[PDB]
């Protein structure tokens, strides 16, 4: 049975606060760190149960996760069953056709021992909690770096920096979530280590945790906007409307959240807002060949690359349940300033903004790493298409800094190719393990 009282809340629910801080730390004097981990952190770690009840959301929601080197600093030599986690993300960078030479230097190594995720409706409240932690831990905790993040303002609340509504699609955990139309339904052990049908044996104290893949993904927003205007397909509407269509073709949803598979030529903001309808699709359409039809959604669209649905078989009618083991829970939040007047006018980025990307999964090789390397970065994925060369994911697809060839985006001609510069630039990140709450004051403090 899924013991949600013992699972950290960001994993299955998300913090859902206006402001978040990712506080990346090293451990000194581990015996002292441990005493404070047990006395000061464990009691204020927010659980799934706590966050699932709108009446027990804490003022400051706190989660904590440890890198491989952080667990080792705590004297934990156990095999958590994940080679990617053990090796650290810097060693995995070439899997994604990037180089750590481009990373924030603190990520390009294994000095980071963990991350504290703090979330609250104001930054003052976060800062007070950080000050309390630094006060009680003293020098046994050392801040290496941090990243502040926020829900975007006004009509962009819940949208990422390019302007698209985010956080729509997640796997439903069988026995825990009430599935929405079209939502994949997966065994708990796809996300939670040691939960139902996790095939990898874990240390006993690690049952109820998850691996957290963090990526600091800069977004080149003025450049993206200008690209869409410059490449907008011909049509009856305003130039901006035609540019908007191209952007929707790249993501697989309109900015409103409406999936293009269900509304391929025009936005439907009412559909985008409706969780009962906005995920209710499989990419299959009766009367169309799944292997060649890109009129509803390109084969290269971001969401189609990252959850293939009927492209990997299974039910043609919703819900499609394919590739459940390749599911990830996403808890990303935007970072950086909004686009400034001068950046928009010059079509040029000056300040860094983007997505503080967070993915949870029980097996890094099946989740984030797989989606990036085997799907998004693979010009021949999905398989069995005509033309066979789908191209790269236009949002996240990487090829060692080169422009990406992306096919199928133009509704007028599915064979038309575009060469697209990166609009998302990796600054690196790390793989962490978010332990069950019991382990925080338990094994990890022993
Ligand atoms: C700055 C970088 C990124 C941006 C701007 C971005 C944006 C989006 C947007 C707008 C959606 C549609 C909203 C939704 O369906 O919930 C989405 C969905 C999704 N993204 Fe990305 N994303 C980024 C990075 C990533 C990465 C690195 C991965 C994995 C390697 C990823 C995996 C997914 C998945 C699995 C979905 C849901 C697909 C589905 O279930 O249909 N995203 N993203």
Author numbering: 3 to 448
What does the paper say about this structure?
DyPs (dye-decolorizing peroxidases) (EC 1.11.1.19) represent a new family of haem peroxidases widespread in bacteria, archaea, fungi and other micro-organisms. In the present study, we expressed A. auricula-judae DyP in E. coli, solved the crystal structure of the recombinant enzyme and several site-directed variants, and used PELE (Protein Energy Landscape Exploration) to describe the binding of its typical substrate RB19. The DyP structure is formed by two domains, each of them including an antiparallel four-stranded large β-sheet and two or three helices resulting in a ferredoxin-like fold (plus two additional β-strands). In spite of the obvious similarity between the two domains, only the C-terminal domain harbours a haem cofactor.
Among them, Tyr-147, Tyr337 and Trp-377 are solvent-exposed, but Trp-105 and Tyr-285 are buried into the protein making their interaction with the dye substrate more difficult. Aromatic residues were changed to serine in the simple W377S, Y147S and Y337S variants (the latter with low refolding yield). Moreover, most of the variants show crystal structures largely superimposable with that of WT DyP, except for the mutated residues. In contrast, similar Tyr-337 and Tyr-147 variants (and the double Y147F/Y337F variant) only slightly affected substrate oxidation, and did not remove the high-turnover site. However, this does not seem to be due to modification of Tyr-337 (or contiguous Tyr-147) since the enzyme activity was practically unaffected after site-directed mutagenesis of these two residues. Among the 65 DyP sequences compared, 58 include a tryptophan residue homologous with Trp-377, and 48 include a tyrosine residue homologous with Tyr-337 (whereas the neighbour Tyr-147 is only conserved in 14 sequences).
